[PDB]
Amino acid sequence: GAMNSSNYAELFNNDIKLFVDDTNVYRVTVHKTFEGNVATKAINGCIFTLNPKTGHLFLKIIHTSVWAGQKRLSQLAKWKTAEEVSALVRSLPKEEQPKQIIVTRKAMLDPLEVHMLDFPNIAIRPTELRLPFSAAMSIDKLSDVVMKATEPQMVLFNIYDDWLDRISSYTAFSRLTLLLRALKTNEESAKMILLSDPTITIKSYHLWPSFTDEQWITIESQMRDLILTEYGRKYNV
């Protein structure tokens, strides 16, 4: 059934699973026509498909050409997401296919279910968690590869860099969701915190800076403050 606070540790057991977030698949800038009416112009999007145990990210880039001449694009985006996730599963060896797929938005359930009819033993699950994966496009390297794409393209990342050499999956997922929650609530402040010290760099093969354990504790604490703050600045508390 649905994934929630009660069954959170299930994410880090040894059953292969993937989160699918579709919030950045269909992206537009809304603007004005010469006649003063409003039009949208699409920009490149991405499906965010993530193994929460290993950190492997399957970033399917959605090129704006896929929308050409199509109607009802927000509905199409959900079905295009499900088509691409099903294609990814079929591309994997059987022993690498997930046993569950968890969609971050419930409107993806029926599209994914129908595209995965060939896979009756892969459970499609919603979740009650309000996960911050929409903020993936605030990670500069992921944003950069999406915007530069000139054709459909799959790019593979590890969203945990090398963290699993020192911390568990539970702890790495918690750090990731904290970082992303901060970038979502105040991207500018969040990015200031991550780069403030010019001596800590981002390795070419990494997404995040190379913090020591002590520096991660400092960073994580600065991110919590920002989140509570914005929760005050928002609500006035």
Added chain:
Amino acid sequence: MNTVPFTSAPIEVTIGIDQYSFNVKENQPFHGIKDIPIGHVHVIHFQHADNSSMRYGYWFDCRMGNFYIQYDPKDGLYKMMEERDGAKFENIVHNFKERQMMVSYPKIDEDDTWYNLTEFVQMDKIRKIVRKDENQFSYVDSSMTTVQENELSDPAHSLNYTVINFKSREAIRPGHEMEDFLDKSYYLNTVMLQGIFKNSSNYFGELQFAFLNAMFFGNYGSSLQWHAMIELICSSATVPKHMLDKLDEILYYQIKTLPEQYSDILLNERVWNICLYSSFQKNSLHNTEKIMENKYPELL
């Protein structure tokens, strides 16, 4: 005009024939039902005074044989049986009619309610849904489950309705996932009409039979089946014009005949709102929409 005589009525029971129902007292001198119109299927059904649990009854066609009812005190129900001896039967019936011990199926139907509810229902199709080949008539009751319900137990007692499942490989062409799920015309017209049912008359007959079992026996799986067959039409953008017009007449008479106090259970809000107001056919069911609005606007 045909007759279904009763040996006796040893227990107090409510007996219904079609949309008519009447009460019989324990050991009342009741010996059956005469003047039954020829040319239609019929259903005789029973609800005991002492255990309203289990409504049950028998679908039959008097052209296919001479049928009678007899209470069985071991199995505790009114059983339909066939009399093979034609002259033994006319004699039984004639003597009962002479003693005026049979109620008469009422002659005037200004709106022909029963024809309109059974227009496409044939005995031969009923007998394929309800499998018991040694009898010319078909037993149905409140508790019988459908094949599809059994998938999600005793098969000899199942309702073998046609399985409809909107998230199934039968319903969804590979490569047309979105198209086929949002517009079920290929599942309606190619899979079901051309492939399985062969024509719309047979589709409508199963839809009508499912409704009637839902209404007369409170059979839950039958109600599920009725609504799924409606939803499959309403969710198809491409439906033969004759089918849409006929469907409007079909549903109109079903909603007209439904007990006003059973709409809480036998009508599925989601299906009806989608069918009358959101589906491709939201504008093609004027009479059904008119009577649903003037009779169950709460549900909507």
